[PDB]
């Protein structure tokens, strides 16, 4: 028990059917933190589904997501649910629940994802921008990167701080948080990686590239409502 959430297992359904992940957590208070869920298309960025707060059972979605997913929680059992229905071959996605802090409103811990399959086979406006330049970034190890993120409008908040992130998703994994509120590495990230920028400006800097820090970098914006990520940077070796 160090923080874990463990989503349901894998799931393969028709069309017009329903489906209900879940996500079990350990390892912290569970009604003490807002419970997020994404969702991530194949070789897609991550969409903000939306998110509730386990202690009144109280939700807020993407607008885009609204009256297609449900949100739960049972407190007796530290389980957050999200509920699909009418599957679509377009809801065939890798989902994830991330628990969001308050310090940093940032994604602090991820599950492993579930992966659905929607399939009748039986085995297998004003919302802010954020744009992530270059696409990808091939390199050769030992090498310096330097990637920037870039969003329509300031992220700077009221309080004076800026909620500006990078998470970093390795293969076939979870993403997972390296760097909140642009700056401030987390727990366990290394001193190469650097967060810096301000206002719509930001860079996430690397300064020697190893095999542990290949995959995509996302970044992502939370001082404005909803949340928006970055389409994604992919570190790869030449
Ligand atoms: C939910 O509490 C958070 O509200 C907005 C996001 O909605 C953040 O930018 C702010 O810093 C607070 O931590
Ligand atoms: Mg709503
Ligand atoms: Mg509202
Ligand atoms: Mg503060
Ligand atoms: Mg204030």
């Known amino acids: 028990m160090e923080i874990q959430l463990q989503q349901s297992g894998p799931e393969l359904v028709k069309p017009g059917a329903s489906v209900k992940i879940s996500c079990k957590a350990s390892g912290y208070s569970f009604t003490d933190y807002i419970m997020l869920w994404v969702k991530q298309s194949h070789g897609k960025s991550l969409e903000w589904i939306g998110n509730i707060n386990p202690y009144y059972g109280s939700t807020s979605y993407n607008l885009k997501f609204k009256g297609k997913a449900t949100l739960t929680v049972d407190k007796s059992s530290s389980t957050a649910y999200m509920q699909l229905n009418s599957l679509t071959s377009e809801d065939s996605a890798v989902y994830y629940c991330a628990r969001k802090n308050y310090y940093g409103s940032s994604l602090d811990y991820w599950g492993q994802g579930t992966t659905l399959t929607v399939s009748s086979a039986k085995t297998t406006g004003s919302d802010v921008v954020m744009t992530q330049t270059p696409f990808s970034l091939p390199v050769s190890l030992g090498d310096q990167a330097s990637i920037s993120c870039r969003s329509s409008?300031?992220?700077?908040?009221?309080?004076?701080?800026?909620?500006l992130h990078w998470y970093l998703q390795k293969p076939g994994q979870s993403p997972k948080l390296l760097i909140y509120?642009?700056?401030n590495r987390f727990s366990g990230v290394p001193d190469r990686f650097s967060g810096s920028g301000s206002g719509t400006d930001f860079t996430l800097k690397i300064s020697r590239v190893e095999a542990e820090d290949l995959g995509v970098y996302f970044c992502s914006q939370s001082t404005h409502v909803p949340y928006t990520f970055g389409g994604g940077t992919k570190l790869e070796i030449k």
């Open positions: 509120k642009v700056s």
């Open positions: 409008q300031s992220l700077v908040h009221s309080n004076g701080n800026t909620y």
